[PDB]
Amino acid sequence: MPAIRVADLLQHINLMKTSDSYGFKEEYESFFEGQSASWDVAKKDQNRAKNRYGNIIAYDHSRVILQPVDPSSDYINANYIDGYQRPSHYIATQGPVHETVYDFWRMIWQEQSACIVMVTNLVEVGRVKCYKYWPDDTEVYGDFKVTCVEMEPLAEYVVRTFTLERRGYNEIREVKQFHFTGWPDHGVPYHATGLLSFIRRVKLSNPPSAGPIVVHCSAGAGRTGCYIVIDIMLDMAEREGVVDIYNCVKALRSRRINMVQTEEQYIFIHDAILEACLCGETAIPVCEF
């Protein structure tokens, strides 16, 4: 499956929405659905309470291994994913549950992550999709003290700046959470515009020297997948004038089960990248209205 020139992306997308022979249905259905690798550690009885969705758990070969605190405390439902010319640039993870909040922060500390990207709301309908693992003011989780030092609310997202302290460690770290709130309860965004703005804000904020960006939604598969693929493809487009969305999804799915969970999401990835390529960074509303 060859890469698509960015100038050809608009026709490629139309054809994929039009062709009776081969379109988005056929292409999406060709991805490997389900378990493609061992997840023995994720499946052991001691880690049962650590997985939000029992079907979307971390593969052995690509998982984030925590130094023990309890032999079974090496586990978090999280996998490393490569970025564009950036090995292990992301961690794809579930939305923490009450029982994994402490491990979540341990992972942030261990991996020296500067950015958390949250692509879910806490509650959707009446279903709790993610634990509120951060304070509005200050909170302690085990030996971690998290303090919210700034909140910057935009239309479709909020940027929260924290300090992170660990008992017994002299260094006070900063962690910034980029919380996209403009993902609809059902579907994909009607406009890619807010998510693109969000994506560009993260690119501008993450230090190249920082650890992996921690990306999560609820399960850590669908919306997490969308964010990462768009982010990587925009890097590829800028450098090479080409995107390879199909092989990008394929690569993610080697690292973590079912990244990009629906065909609608796969199509949305295309629409979002196209708006980004057509419109750019300084765009007026007439572009892809």
Question: How many angstroms separate the CA atoms of 256 and 93, rounded?
Answer: 9
263-279 vs 222-240: helix crossing angle, rounded to 10: 30
> Which helix (DSSP H) or strand (DSSP E) does residue 90 occupy?
strand 86-93
Helix (H, G, I), strand (E, B) or coil at 159: strand
Q: How would you class 253 by CB atoms within 10 Å of its CB: exposed for 0-12, middle for 13-18, buried for 19 or more? A: buried
C-alpha–C-alpha distance, residues 176 and 161, integer Å: 4
Query: Is residue 223 part of an annotated ligand binding site?
Result: yes
Of 4, 39, 284, 172, whose CA–CA distance to 161 is shortest?
172
User: Token pair for residue 148?
Assistant: 């919210």
Header resolution in angstroms = 2.0
CA distance 150 to 168: 25
| 101 to 108, 130, 140, 264: CA distances (angstroms) | 11, 10, 11, 31
| Cβ contacts of 244 within 8 Å, gap of 6 or more | 1, 2, 3, 4, 233, 236
Give kind and range of the element (H or E) at residue 1: none
Q: From the candidates 115, 130, 217, 277, which is the catalytic residue? A: 217
Q: Does residue 106 sit in helix, strand or coil?
A: helix
Q: In what order do the strands lie in the sheet with 213-216?
A: 78-83, 86-93, 213-216, 115-118, 173-180, 157-166, 144-153, 138-141
3-state secondary structure of 260: coil
Residue 166 annotated as binding site: no
Which of 229, 221, 227 is closest to 262 using CA atoms? 221
C-alpha 50/C-alpha 199 separation (Å) is 29
Q: Distance (Å, rounded) from C-alpha 79 to C-alpha 63? A: 4
Which of 81, 26, 15, 28 has the alpha carbon at shortest distance from 246?
Answer: 28
146-150: which pairs have CB atoms within 8 A and are 24 or more residues apart? Answer: 146/105, 146/175
Domain layout of the chain by residue ranges: 1-289
Query: Residue 185, SS3?
Result: coil
185 is in an annotated binding site: yes
* Residue in 110, 99, 119 with CA at minimum distance from that of residue 52: 99
Cα–Cα distance measured from residue 22 to residue 3, given in angstroms and rounded to the nearest whole number: 16
Query: Does residue 76 sit in helix, strand or coil?
Result: coil
Does the annotation list 280 as a binding residue? no
Total Cβ atoms within 10 A of residue 249:
22
Query: For residue 140, what are its two tokens?
Result: 């302690």
Q: Quick check: helix, strand or coil at residue 9?
A: helix
Residue 219 known to bind ligand: yes
Residue 212: which of 93, 113, 82 has the closest Cα?
Answer: 113
Residue 70, annotated as binding a ligand: no
CA of residue 31 relative to chain centroid, distance:
19
Please state, as a whole number, how many other Cβ atoms lie within 10 Å of the Cβ of residue 45.
7
Query: Which two tokens mark 107?
Result: 């992972």
Compute the chain's Rg from CA coordinates. Answer: 19
What token pair was written down for 119? 């692509």
Catalytic site residue 217?
yes
Q: Is 221 annotated as a binding residue?
A: yes
Residue 191: Cβ-neighbour burial (10 angstroms; 0-12, 13-18, 19+): middle
Q: How far apart are CA 24 and CA 264, in angstroms?
A: 9
CATH classification (class only), 1-289: alpha beta
Q: How far apart are CA 267 and CA 188, in angstroms?
A: 9
Which technique was the structure solved with, according to the deposited record?
X-ray
Mapped onto helix, strand or coil, the DSSP state of residue 5 is strand
Distance from C-alpha of 134 to C-alpha of 74, rounded to nearest angstrom? 22
